[PDB]
């Protein structure tokens, strides 16, 4: 349940420490973003040597949500802190070479298979 003006932690190491969601992409009037959802973000805090600089507008995918994900047996997986992986604007591939923290098995599709290959837990 990431909406507009939600501050997200950043799972990869593109350089952003903390970003802000500015639109949940896909569909008109859409409210929220889950783990399998692309959003547009802007960067509020960056690392001084990183790739992305503070004040850029690009895209991310959510990887951890405090609202969680509900598996088909009814089980929920509620992380602590909302987290995203920064993607490119039109390439839609991750800008990081590594990924911190665990991610979710319901992210497993081709491009995010390239994401979860770097992931230490799925």
């Amino acid at each position: 349940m990431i909406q507009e003006q939600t501050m997200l932690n950043v799972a990869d190491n593109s350089g952003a420490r903390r970003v802000m969601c500015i639109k949940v992409l896909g569909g008109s009037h859409r409210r929220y973003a889950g783990v399998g959802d692309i959003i547009k973000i802007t960067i509020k805090e960056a690392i001084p040597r990183g790739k992305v600089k503070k004040g850029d507008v690009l895209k991310a995918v959510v990887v951890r949500t405090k609202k969680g994900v509900r598996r088909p047996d009814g089980s929920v997986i509620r992380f602590d802190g909302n987290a995203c992986v920064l993607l490119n604007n039109n390439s839609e591939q991750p800008i990081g070479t590594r990924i911190f923290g665990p991610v979710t098995r319901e992210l497993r599709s081709e491009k995010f298979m390239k994401i979860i290959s770097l992931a230490p837990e799925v």
Partner: protein, 209 residues
């Protein structure tokens, strides 16, 4: 074909072996004994009249008791009628059991929903509440405006306003029938059917198939 009349007894969930937990509603579909067969001769249309359960011996009035004991059935709670689509015959007195849904794949369930009573427009019609701070005066969940001005000069019929919500007949359509248990007269459907636990449900095969 026809439908069957059952009683809602709670919701449960079926754990299938692959992992997926199907949340089911249990419908105890008892034996429906046919009471009257309406045909083209007397009625100008063809339909059957069924009953289920059993009332007490003295609660049944004399007209109902004569109607039941006219043809071979014992008195149950309420009479119902299904409209017999062109080529099916059910003899008077025949108990119809639940394997009719052991044939079929999808089901629509008709019931009287739970009554919320006199509900306001925010609950009844999903109206957006007015701004709950910023100066608002006795007007948070009020409906707002209900008409334009002098040119209509009247509220149009079918205006969404506060009123009785619930306690009406609604039909939920195309539910997956999960299990037909003839040994305990259980019918289990996937999803939420209308009504409180105990209200009568009319269970038909799905027509939007």
């Amino acid at each position: 074909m026809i439908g069957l009349v059952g009683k809602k007894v709670g919701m449960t969930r079926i754990f299938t072996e692959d992992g997926v937990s199907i949340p089911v509603t249990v419908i105890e579909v008892e034996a429906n004994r046919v009471t009257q067969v309406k045909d083209l001769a007397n009625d100008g249309y063809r339909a059957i009249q069924v009953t289920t359960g059993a009332k007490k011996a003295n609660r049944v009035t004399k007209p109902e008791a004569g109607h039941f004991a006219k043809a071979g059935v014992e008195a149950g709670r309420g009479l119902w009628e299904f409209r017999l689509a062109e080529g099916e015959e059910f003899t008077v007195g025949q108990s119809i059991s639940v394997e009719l849904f052991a044939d079929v794949k999808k089901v629509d369930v008709t019931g009287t929903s739970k009554g919320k009573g006199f509900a306001g427009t925010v609950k009844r019609w999903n109206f957006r509440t007015q701004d709950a701070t910023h100066g608002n005066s006795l007007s948070h969940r009020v409906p707002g405006s209900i008409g334009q001005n002098q040119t209509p000069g009247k509220v149009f019929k079918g205006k969404k306003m506060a009123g009785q919500m619930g306690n009406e007949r609604v039909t939920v359509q195309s539910l997956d029938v999960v299990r037909v248990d003839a040994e305990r007269n259980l019918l289990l459907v996937k999803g939420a059917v209308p009504g409180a636990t105990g209200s009568d449900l009319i269970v038909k095969p799905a027509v939007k198939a």
